[PDB]
Design a protein around this ligand. Structure first.
Ligand SMILES: [Ca+2]
Ligand SMILES: [Ca+2]
Ligand SMILES: [Zn+2]
Lengths: 148, 99
């Protein structure tokens, strides 16, 4: 079943043990933890990259794994449509303190066509792809995160 | 200028307006006179770097209110400082939704 605006699955807070677990600290560009992050170059994912830095591609191995599975299910669901990432790992700083975006453990996503009528189902597909927490965060995107 | 501003925060103040506040340190460009800042904003649904609209603000300001935006719409926001010689690097790019 599709999620609706403001709904999350599992229906518990993101940082709970059963969901994505605790924040571990912001990962900055000059840091040692930054080396755990490698760019996702999957040709079936669109990365917004408004930053012109490639930051949105950077994410943990687990985040990659679930994101790549979702890329397949999106194309299966709606032929001609692809998964789009608006935010991956972030250094711009507009996310809340303790945001999993600062650790490469969260992505904001849309469909390639920006058809908001598809977002509830996109959220369901992210749950089925194995994201540890999926949140219809905004009318404009779905937020998906993973455990450390 | 060869150092651009840094956007500290963006926050929606209404369904049509977003406040942004930046830092810019004059000595980062040897105290070269800066004539002002350019503030760029485009709907987040666009990935077309040509779709940024621009506001021009004076050099003394460290904040700006962008107006005439669309209700409940996300915007990509970035900025430059400028002078007679030309323009800086772009800042960090924030994403911010109107109410
Ligand atoms: Ca981005
Ligand atoms: Ca970002
Ligand atoms: Zn998010």
């Amino acid at each position: 079943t599709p999620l609706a605006y403001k709904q999350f699955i599992p229906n518990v807070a993101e940082k709970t043990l059963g969901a994505s677990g605790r924040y571990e600290g912001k990962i900055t560009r000059n840091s040692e933890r930054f080396k755990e992050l490698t760019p996702n170059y999957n040709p079936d994912i669109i990365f917004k990259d408004e930053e012109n830095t490639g930051a949105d591609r950077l994410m943990t191995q687990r985040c990659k794994d679930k994101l790549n599975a979702l890329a397949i299910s999106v194309m299966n669901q709606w032929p001609g449509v692809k998964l789009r990432v608006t935010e991956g790992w972030d250094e711009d700083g507009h996310h809340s303190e303790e945001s999993l975006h600062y650790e490469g453990r969260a992505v904001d996503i849309t469909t390639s066509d920006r058809d908001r009528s598809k977002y509830g189902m996109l959220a369901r597909l992210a749950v089925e792809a194995g994201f540890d927490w999926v949140y219809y965060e905004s009318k404009a995107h779905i937020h998906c995160s993973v455990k450390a | 200028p060869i150092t651009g501003p840094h956007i500290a925060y963006t926050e929606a103040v209404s369904d049509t307006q977003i406040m942004l506040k930046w830092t810019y340190i004059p000595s980062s460009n040897n105290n070269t006179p800066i004539q002002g800042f350019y503030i760029y904003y485009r709907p987040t649904d666009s990935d077309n770097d040509s779709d940024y609209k621009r506001d021009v603000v004076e050099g003394s300001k460290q904040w700006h209110m962008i107006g005439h935006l669309q209700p409940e719409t996300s915007y990509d926001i970035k900025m430059q400082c400028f002078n007679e010689g030309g323009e800086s690097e772009f800042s960090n790019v924030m994403i911010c939704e109107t109410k």
